[PDB]
């Protein structure tokens, strides 16, 4: 019975904490990497036009 509870807690810690956090962090970083790429092209266009 105890070992059942021990497995339940791990399943649950994965389903309700670890997997969500991973999933949410992954989506966040994709977005951030995307903003940075956009920021760079904005600055490169301005740089080019100092000419």
């Amino acid at each position: 019975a105890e070992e059942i509870e021990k497995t339940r807690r791990r399943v649950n810690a994965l389903e309700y904490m670890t997997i969500p956090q991973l999933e949410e962090t992954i989506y966040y970083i994709k977005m951030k990497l995307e903003e940075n790429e956009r920021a760079e092209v904005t600055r490169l266009i301005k740089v080019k036009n100092m000419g």
């Binding site: 019975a1 070992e3 059942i4 497995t7 339940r8 791990r10 399943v11 994965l14 389903e15 670890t18 997997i19 956090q21 991973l22 999933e23 949410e24 962090t25 992954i26 966040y28 970083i29 994709k30 951030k32 990497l33 940075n36």
Partner: protein, 48 residues
Amino acid sequence: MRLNVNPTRMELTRLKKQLTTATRGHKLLKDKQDELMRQFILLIRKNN
């Protein structure tokens, strides 16, 4: 709530791998939980 990590290309690749692992581990932990449970039911009836 997201984890405290730095938004680098390598971090993304790490977490994506860590996530595929996490997912698979979760299914296998569910599988065991269910096995132990039906083995538990047999024994708990004996106990009773």
